[PDB]
């Protein structure tokens, strides 16, 4: 049993036609204070797979440290590393969701929301959820602690069951990342402006984005507003 | 007296642990392998005897990798060598979660130096009956 001291916060994910798109900020909070502002929170393990995980930012080093060396141990003895039996997404999840079901278990968990985004090798789109309790589940959308009440709803309306999925295209889909993540900054206290988004599709690879901004932003309201009640100046 | 060559650990009247000699033949007649170290780099390469037209090309694999730089090739007892790579393996990914940077090469080398000694120091084990040449890049 442990607590959470360096923490990120929401991972948002989506699926489109092609392929899926992954993002999450680069903050590192520290309680109330948002300490660290250089934290990628996005793990990209291959060409084929990006692993966003929020919470103890301690706890994701070490699952990148495990990550790294399931590539290095996968290459040893095998001549088609780099093909037909390269890491697949499915693979590297439920390796992970192994792990914090494990953990769970021995009651010292790994304080945790980890989304798996990837396409696998037939073209399918992969999306699953895995927490600290070892709870795992699949959905058109995917969002990590405070994106799951404000990002979903948002990207519901994009794709609202599993027929939505052909239909919605990159640039749909990024707008509607990209939006939730402007919302996310309006409303999460623990947010950054500056994030990061990976866009894992099955004919153009692999395509990472650094250092995000969100733009856009309306405040000019705010002029408008003064006191609380009955107060006019 | 004799039967100074019968246990693993016993030194003979003239110093000499004649298990290891033994062990020696034993690479002796396996395949030849070789390695030639370049301006910035090392080369491996190995003899595969095709014993018959049923042997598979290019799938029996002979070199190995440790971690992600170091290439290592072996002659004579090929499970023997495989059991070395596997410790090499391990004593590679100890070092890398202690000190983050992976293991130098010299570092590696007496590391696989230590553990093919150990196997001369008791008669409850068998020497190693392979000649592994390795290497790789690393920091100079």
């Given at each position: 049993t442990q607590q959470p001291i360096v923490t990120g916060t929401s991972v948002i994910s989506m699926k489109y036609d092609n392929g899926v798109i992954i993002a999450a900020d680069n903050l590192g909070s520290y309680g109330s204070l948002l300490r660290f502002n250089g934290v990628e929170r996005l793990i990209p393990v291959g060409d084929n797979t990006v692993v966003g995980i929020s919470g103890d930012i301690s706890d994701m080093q070490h699952i990148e440290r495990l990550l790294k060396?399931?590539?290095?141990?996968?290459?040893?003895?095998?001549?088609?590393?780099?093909?037909?039996?390269?890491?697949?997404?499915?693979?590297?999840?439920?390796?992970?969701?192994?792990?914090?079901?494990?953990?769970?278990?021995?009651?010292n968990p790994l304080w945790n929301a980890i989304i798996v985004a990837g396409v696998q090798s037939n073209g399918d789109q992969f999306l699953r959820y895995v927490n600290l309790l070892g709870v795992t589940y699949s959905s058109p959308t995917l969002a990590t602690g405070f994106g799951a009440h404000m990002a979903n709803p948002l990207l519901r309306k994009v794709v609202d069951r599993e027929s939505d999925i052909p239909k919605t295209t990159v640039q749909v889909?990024?707008?509607?990342?990209?939006?939730?993540?402007?919302?996310?900054?309006?409303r999460d206290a623990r947010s950054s402006r500056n994030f990061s988004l990976a866009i894992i599709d099955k004919n153009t690879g692999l395509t990472f984005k650094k250092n995000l901004q969100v733009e856009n932003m309306k405040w000019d309201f705010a002029k408008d507003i003064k006191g609380y009640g009955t107060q006019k100046i | 007296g004799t039967g100074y060559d019968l246990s693993n650990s016993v030194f003979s009247p003239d110093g000499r642990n004649f298990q290891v000699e033994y062990a020696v033949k034993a690479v002796e007649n396996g395949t030849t392998s070789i390695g030639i170290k370049c301006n910035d780099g090392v080369v491996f390469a190995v003899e595969k005897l095709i014993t018959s037209k049923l042997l598979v090309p290019q799938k029996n694999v002979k070199i190995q990798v440790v971690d992600r730089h170091?290439?290592?090739?072996?002659?004579?007892?090929?499970?023997?060598?495989?059991?070395?790579?596997?410790?090499?393996?391990?004593?590679?990914?100890?070092?890398?979660?202690?000190?983050?940077?992976?293991?130098?090469?010299?570092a590696f080398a007496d590391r696989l130096g230590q553990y093919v000694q150990a196997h001369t120091?008791?008669?409850?084990?068998?020497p190693f009956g392979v000649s592994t040449i390795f290497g790789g890049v690393d920091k100079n």
């Amino acid at each position: 049993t442990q607590q959470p001291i360096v923490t990120g916060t929401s991972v948002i994910s989506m699926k489109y036609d092609n392929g899926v798109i992954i993002a999450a900020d680069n903050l590192g909070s520290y309680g109330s204070l948002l300490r660290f502002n250089g934290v990628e929170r996005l793990i990209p393990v291959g060409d084929n797979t990006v692993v966003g995980i929020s919470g103890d930012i301690s706890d994701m080093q070490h699952i990148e440290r495990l990550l790294k060396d399931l590539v290095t141990e996968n290459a040893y003895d095998n001549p088609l590393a780099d093909a037909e039996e390269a890491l697949e997404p499915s693979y590297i999840f439920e390796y992970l969701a192994t792990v914090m079901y494990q953990r769970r278990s021995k009651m010292n968990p790994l304080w945790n929301a980890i989304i798996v985004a990837g396409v696998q090798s037939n073209g399918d789109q992969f999306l699953r959820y895995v927490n600290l309790l070892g709870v795992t589940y699949s959905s058109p959308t995917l969002a990590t602690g405070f994106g799951a009440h404000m990002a979903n709803p948002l990207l519901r309306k994009v794709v609202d069951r599993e027929s939505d999925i052909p239909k919605t295209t990159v640039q749909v889909a990024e707008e509607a990342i990209v939006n939730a993540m402007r919302v996310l900054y309006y409303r999460d206290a623990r947010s950054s402006r500056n994030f990061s988004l990976a866009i894992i599709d099955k004919n153009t690879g692999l395509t990472f984005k650094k250092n995000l901004q969100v733009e856009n932003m309306k405040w000019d309201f705010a002029k408008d507003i003064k006191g609380y009640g009955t107060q006019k100046i | 007296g004799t039967g100074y060559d019968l246990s693993n650990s016993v030194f003979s009247p003239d110093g000499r642990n004649f298990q290891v000699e033994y062990a020696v033949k034993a690479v002796e007649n396996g395949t030849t392998s070789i390695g030639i170290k370049c301006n910035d780099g090392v080369v491996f390469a190995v003899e595969k005897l095709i014993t018959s037209k049923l042997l598979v090309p290019q799938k029996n694999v002979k070199i190995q990798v440790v971690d992600r730089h170091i290439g290592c090739v072996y002659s004579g007892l090929i499970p023997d060598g495989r059991h070395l790579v596997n410790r090499g393996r391990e004593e590679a990914a100890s070092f890398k979660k202690l000190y983050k940077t992976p293991i130098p090469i010299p570092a590696f080398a007496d590391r696989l130096g230590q553990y093919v000694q150990a196997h001369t120091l008791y008669n409850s084990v068998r020497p190693f009956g392979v000649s592994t040449i390795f290497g790789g890049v690393d920091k100079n």
